[model samples]
Target chain A: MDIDPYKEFGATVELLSFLPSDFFPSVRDLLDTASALYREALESPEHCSPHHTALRQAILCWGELMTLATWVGVNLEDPASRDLVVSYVNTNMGLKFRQLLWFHISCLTFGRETVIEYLVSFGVWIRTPPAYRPPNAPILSTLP
Target chain B: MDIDPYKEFGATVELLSFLPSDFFPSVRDLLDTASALYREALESPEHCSPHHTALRQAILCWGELMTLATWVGVNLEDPASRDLVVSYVNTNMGLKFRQLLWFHISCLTFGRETVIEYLVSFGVWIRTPPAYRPPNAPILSTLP
Candidate 1:
């Protein structure tokens, strides 16, 4: 799709502000300052060192927040789903999710094509259901 | 935490390439082209219309892919976890994940602060386990 990355990014900020969650303190102010720094970096690239540093920090923070938000949004539909997410966050699986997120954000820097390719592969994984295990498999038989 | 977005993104591409999964066809080529286009956009912003368009398309694609990738990575550790992700993708909860992703990318547009706030909130959600529900409650009593 033909989208303006800048616009999309802004919308994310707007959506986060609307959520009634106690995730961050002074979220409003945080966004405002980050917004200002971004503009400053764009307007003066030569001396944008500090601005860039702050921007990177903000991006990392954003990635973390988005990860959590996505999980909650997806799993909050019912009690069963809610339990799934709760369990995920409380286990090693949650760490894997963070690792994947790191990989994802990293891909964003290389180019759009790289990101797309990475994503396409992800789609394949999601669509293809795992190999089914028979109820009377060797492993199961040995369990009892 | 301090990080270089560009480097991290590249690392992600490398990691994806390393995985022995049937996710993407010709991932190597896709990343190469995207990398070239990203450089081209940086070199000539004055006439970077087509480049920007392609880049944006790549980005949107990346978001979708990453969402699935994250799910699989987090859920592939065991059968139960795998089942969780599988069931999730087959249900409306999957759609919610996409919705959250869209919101996330949009937030990237405004400023670093916005993204951070969004992330911080997400962290809270993940860290804070869902409230416990008593099984001998009204909802359960009505079921029988």
Candidate 2:
């Protein structure tokens, strides 16, 4: 769970590159640049800027290509390694992580869980998006 | 988006029965009983017990199956009807619902989806519990 985001994100980029299928064009490149900028941001004075949070958006955006269950199945078979990946996801998504996990698992081909086999089989939906307006990505109890 | 949970649940049971595949045996039955009790709960305040949130549980349990892309392709093709179903899912799962819609669409046989063909597309994991776990039945997000 205590993985260095810089290192983890770096490894993930390489992992994604070797995959059989491809994501949106330049998606990995976008992720690569984002991770680099995030690394730079970490060294700066105003890092966690609530106002200037655009950089970390990469982590939230494509950073999750990390959890492609496809990746998990092939690579993260070890319990310790899988737990680390889960921790990384948990760190990135915050409280909404579990719901996103459920939705992700549900979307898996044939309703399969990831190779580490992340399970969402519990009282996961505590906070649904508010009515009147449409909801966002995954319902989050707390924002990341 | 507004569906009668009771009637919808019943209809789902029948639809499930006709499918070429079978879900876990008791999974549907448990859902059936839960929905019936939920209907009766609607009949009185004496219901909705602190101990018994069975109906809502059933909602989360079988609800996604309610949105399974296979079901949508088979039943909600008409524009107006499809819109209603989309709205219902929108109401149920929010904007991520579209992503779910896309993933489910990806699950379709011939690779449909005119808009955005969302692919979880990965080694994306394969038939998991068919071997690893006890084969009680279908993969439910929340087990009964």
DockQ of all models, two decimals each:
0.05, 0.01
Residues B27-144, candidate 1, lDDT per residue (tens digit)? 3344444455354452332323322332443444344445554765564455555555555443433343233233323333343344444445444443454574333322101123
Structural RMSD, model 2: 20.1
lDDT of 2 by residue, A1-144 (tens): 765322421223222222212211233333332332234453466745531243344345544555564478577669888777766664544323322222222322222223112222111211233463333221111001
In the range A2-42, model 1's lDDT, one tens digit per residue, is 33333322222232223223323243444444445344442
Off by over 4 Å in 2: A1-12, A23-56, A59-144, B1-35, B47-138, B141-144
Candidate 2 chain B, poorest ten consecutive residues by summed lDDT:
B114-123
lDDT of 1: 0.38
In the range B19-138, model 2's lDDT, one tens digit per residue, is 222212233444454445445553456644422343344355356645574577577659777767766654444422232222222222122221111111111111121222222322
For model 1, what is the error of residue B136's alpha carbon versus the real structure, in angstroms, after optimal superposition? 73
Task: Provide i-RMS per model in Å.
Answer: 12.6, 16.3
- Two-chain complex of model 1, DockQ on C-alpha atoms against the true structure: 0.05
TM-scores, all models, native as reference: 0.23, 0.21
Q: Going through the candidates in order, state the TM-score of chain A alone for each one.
A: 0.28, 0.24
Clashing pairs in 2: A114-A117, B1-B88, B24-B137, B24-B138
